[PDB]
């Protein structure tokens, strides 16, 4: 479905002579089916491998033997300053090591976790109990 609607010069593409342009309207998945000259209809979704899509992708079953694969995820060349490179991201710079010196300074604890937290409660000692009961 592609409706023809008059669009401003702001949103013009390099070529559009008239203000009139044809553009695609969205469609509900319920109103369109899978092809493979075929029409799938019902899909099962039971098994589930991981593509390395880099995610655990389920199997599309039509009749559970016939599997239709997911399409090929488009390649993507990362060349941004704000994205760290893979190897660096993945590297290991912390092993548990000690049981005497903590991993983080005493002074940095307030930053990562709230003292004066009103949900602490704690206690419930024997001495305390003794103190309360008459």
């Amino acid at each position: 479905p592609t409706k023809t609607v008059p669009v401003p010069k702001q949103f013009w593409l390099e070529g559009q002579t008239s203000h009139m342009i044809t553009i695609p309207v969205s469609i509900l998945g319920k109103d369109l089916r899978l092809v493979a000259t075929v029409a799938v209809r019902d899909v099962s979704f039971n098994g589930s491998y991981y593509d390395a899509y880099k995610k655990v992708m389920p199997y599309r079953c039509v009749q559970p033997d016939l599997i239709i694969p997911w399409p090929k995820p488009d390649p993507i060349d990362v060349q941004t300053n704000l994205a760290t490179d893979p190897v660096i991201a993945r590297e290991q710079t912390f092993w548990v090591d000690s049981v005497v010196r903590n991993p983080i300074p005493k002074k940095a604890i307030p930053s990562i976790r709230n003292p004066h937290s009103k949900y602490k409660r704690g206690t419930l000692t024997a001495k305390d109990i003794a103190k309360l009961v008459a």
Binding site: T80, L82, T93, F94, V99, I112
Partner: protein
Amino acid sequence: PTTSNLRCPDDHPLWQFFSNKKFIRSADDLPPSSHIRPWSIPELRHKSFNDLHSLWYNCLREQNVLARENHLLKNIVGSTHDEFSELSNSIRTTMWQIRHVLNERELAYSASREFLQDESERKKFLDTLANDYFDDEVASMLTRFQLAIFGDINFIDGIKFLANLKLQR
């Protein structure tokens, strides 16, 4: 007054609030969400404290640059595109993950300490370790590591243990 009278420094620390020397990051010059992914908690889990700190600071810096830009977009042009906002949100998520991991590590350490304090189990653990370790150079290395880990009362105890080990071998 004229600006020719000035000599605006090129490496002035206030340029650090912009991407490169640029008023707005263009739609083309932003990192698209297809490429960018926020840091995972598990992945972070094995990262040093210093490195984590550095990462956090970097994130903050990035947010600042986004933040300014976002403000400009909102207040002046009055745009609703919110790419910058999304980016900021992503950064925030990462930051929170980092924070969580930091907390978690501390908690783990505390737990370990508690376990150690329970003297019945700790002794058993030590014994098991000894058994496991019982090459000579390799043993020495392992023993050295153990000593380091151990490292006034505690120190004394460690020393005693070392002595005992030596006696045994």
